[PDB]
Paper text:
Ciliary movement is generated by the axoneme, a molecular machine consisting of microtubules, ATP-powered dynein motors and regulatory complexes. The prototypic axoneme of a motile cilium consists of a cylindrical arrangement of doublet microtubules (DMTs) surrounding a central apparatus comprising two singlet microtubules. DMTs are organized into 96-nm repeating units, which cryo-electron tomography (cryo-ET) studies have shown to be a landscape of interconnected dynein motors and regulatory complexes. In total, there are 11 dynein motors in a single 96-nm repeat unit, and they are classified according to their location (inner and outer) and the number of heavy chains (HCs) they have.
To determine the structure of the modular repeat of the C. reinhardtii axoneme, we reconstructed cryo-EM maps of DMTs from splayed axonemes. Computational limits imposed by the large size of the repeat meant that we focused on individual axonemal complexes by particle subtraction, refinement and classification before reconstituting the full 96-nm repeat in silico. The model includes all three classes of axonemal dynein: the triple-headed ODA, the regulatory double-headed IDAf and all six single-headed IDAs (IDAa–IDAe and IDAg). IDAf is attached to the DMT through a multipartite docking mechanism involving four different anchors. The FAP57 dimer forms a stack of four β-propellers that contacts the fα tail, consistent with the proposed location of FAP57 based on subtomogram averaging. The N terminus of FAP44 binds the fα motor through a pair of β-propellers and its C terminus forms a coiled coil with FAP43 across the DMT surface, terminating at the inner junction between the A and B tubules. Our atomic model shows that the 11-subunit N-DRC is built around long, bifurcated coiled coils that are joined together at a ‘bulb’ on the microtubule-bound baseplate and fork at the N-terminal leucine-rich repeat (LRR) domain of DRC3. OIDL3 involves the LRR domain of the N-DRC subunit DRC7. Specifically, a three-helix bundle of DRC3 contacts the linker of the IDAg motor. The core of IDAf rotates 6° relative to the DMT, whereas the N-DRC linker tilts by 9°.
Residue numbers in the entry:
A (entry chain IA): 358 to 408
B (entry chain Hx): 53 to 104
C (entry chain Hi): 8 to 68
D (entry chain IF): 2 to 123, 143 to 269
E (entry chain IU), F (entry chain Ia): 134 to 346
Write the structure that this text describes.
Amino acid sequence: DKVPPPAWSPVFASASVTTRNQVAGVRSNRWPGAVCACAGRHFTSMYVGWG
Amino acid sequence: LVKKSTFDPKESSPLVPIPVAPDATQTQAAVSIFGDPELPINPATGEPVPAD
Amino acid sequence: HDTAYLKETVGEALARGCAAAISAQPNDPVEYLGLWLLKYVKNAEVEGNFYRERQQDLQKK
Amino acid sequence: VQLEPNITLVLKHLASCGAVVSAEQQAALDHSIPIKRIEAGLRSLTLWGRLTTLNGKDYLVAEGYNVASSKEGAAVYETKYFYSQDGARWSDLQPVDSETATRCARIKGMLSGDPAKNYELELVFQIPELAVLRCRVDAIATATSVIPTDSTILNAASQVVPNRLFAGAAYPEKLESYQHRFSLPGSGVTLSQDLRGTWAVQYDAFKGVAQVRSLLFPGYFFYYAANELTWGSLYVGDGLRNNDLIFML
Amino acid sequence: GKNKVYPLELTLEEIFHGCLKKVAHKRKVLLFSGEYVEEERQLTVDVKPGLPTGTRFVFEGEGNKTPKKEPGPVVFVLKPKPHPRFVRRGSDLVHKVTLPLHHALIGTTLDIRTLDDRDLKVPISDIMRPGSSLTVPGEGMPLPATPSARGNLVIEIDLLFPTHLTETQKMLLRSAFFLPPPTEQNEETKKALRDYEAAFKHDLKGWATVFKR
Amino acid sequence: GKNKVYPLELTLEEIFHGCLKKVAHKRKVLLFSGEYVEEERQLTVDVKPGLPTGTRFVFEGEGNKTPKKEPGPVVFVLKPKPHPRFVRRGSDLVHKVTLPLHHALIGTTLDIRTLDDRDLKVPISDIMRPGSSLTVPGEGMPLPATPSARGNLVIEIDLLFPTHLTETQKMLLRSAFFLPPPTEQNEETKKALRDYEAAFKHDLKGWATVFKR
């Protein structure tokens, strides 16, 4: 494609969008394995995979 | 060699085969709680059926 | 003559097929006998094929 | 000694390698795998892997075969592939013809989410994303599908069946104890016959768990428990290929 | 000289699997009496899987027997009974399905029940054109020549367009049909789309998920 | 009893208005010489407005003249030349136009130039179905019987579906194809729609109207 892929692709935790308490974060595209998540006031980042 | 040399005259059985499968009504109901069921489309008019 | 031609050509194979039809007791012996003869020539050639394949695998190993 | 790898054991043993699935997707997987197995008339159906997409809706791919026989010296499995954004409902993955099988390998970059996306390639050629997805799964399966050696045996009528008396593979750390699925039991073709530096094996001798990772395809993992005979594989990550292997090593 | 042809009706399932049909024949032997003498004769016809339509089965020696001339053979012609889902064409099957417009564009999975006891859920590969079709290999009638190969099931797509559309619905359609490429959208456009999607997929006040009544 | 049949090619404009064609005929008379001698004759044929295709014009006494028998008539058959826009189907014209998908749903106005030098703009009345058509009464070929009444121009619609759609474009399409009726929308829904519309039609940073590059 002629459209460059943007970094920080979204990641979800539920197929349905009406779940009450679902976590949601982002996942980096430049570095595969780095993920950031946040549930209300509790957020955390972590990177697992090849460097 | 005996196994390979056995005659097997496979003939057309008069009855169509029927499948032996356990009932899946219970399991199908459990699956339906996952995901959002899309609103069915009225065959008469392509607009979706009324909903709440 | 004709009897000698029939005996030495298809005499043995037909007798075996008739014996199989007697024991099996199918719903259509003529078709059963015909398919039996077609299988009769088919299993003979694959029997040689089977022996060749087994010999080849041992030599390769 | 097993006849089919468990979905739970594969997810449990590969959690360290990042091969994990969402908890709700895991719950949906348990219910919907038997449903699809009966609906498709298959005697075997297990999760093959998970592919990352530009959207959060990743592709969950599960393969299944009904018959498996020896054909021209290659163990041919009539595999059927299915994909599903979520663990509830599965769709089919049709085979790709040769002409589009060569024009799909030139398309790179991690896939999008909607399977109704058409890539344009050079006059312009239109190719569906599902065709591209099928290509990558086939390529990975050809290069990475690995099972322990002697785990399959040939019965009469030339069919490959699981070895019910498989006692396990001695020296699980050595690469000679693992072989490709499409390798005949008689042939001594193993993963050692592949490239020297494309397979990495880390064996936990105490716990008796051997782990195999593919360096040519970085997203492929395979475990083999030795104390209890249980082996499984799962591909997690994008389906792209690692070309410059000589520089990395 | 003269032969009697009899239509023979089978279902698509029998042709797919291979039936062994039994048929009763009324043979009229003609004699000096004004009325004829009739008898019921049973015949076994073996239809093999995937036989083409129009196959003729002929039984030599059976038929109405005039006193002098030996009766001519009776002819059985194969024709398939109508099926609610599949109509056969050549060696494969045709499945005509009416499809909603939004299913064509966004893309969904067509769910069909095969003649064999298997259930297929074929996805919509791309934007189905009006009058286009989707082909699934190896899902039709078995080849009469070889009992292993199969034809490719053909799904003739028919589009069901919505009957009504509001002015606000058309406005949303126009915006979606002229959206700039993602490498051209402004920051206001990106924020506006994010706000609309969040307010469209709202768990309580959003209309993304609704329950039918 | 042989006759000479010669095709006559006319444009749709000539048949619509009524032309007066002058044709040249090469008549051969056989003499004592080994080779023949021929002459060119001028024939005036008057085609009436809206004559049906296949009309036969016969000129009695015109044709190759054998020494004994009086020459048979020469036959002229009327056939129309291909036209870039219209193809006639009986008493009325047929126009095949490729239509964009968003033109079909939202509704636009087609542009058609008639055989008469009058431009025509016909609005799209509703959701054009795939394979449907539109009819404009009184815009067809003149009736051969009466020189005032005409047929009705028929537009044959072949939809042109978009080739690529992004995930965000599909999301907007789903929201447009499942919008609740205006008597059911929430207050949040009405606010969200008003916000999105004001941003899509933004005078400086909206994509409602743009200039082609």
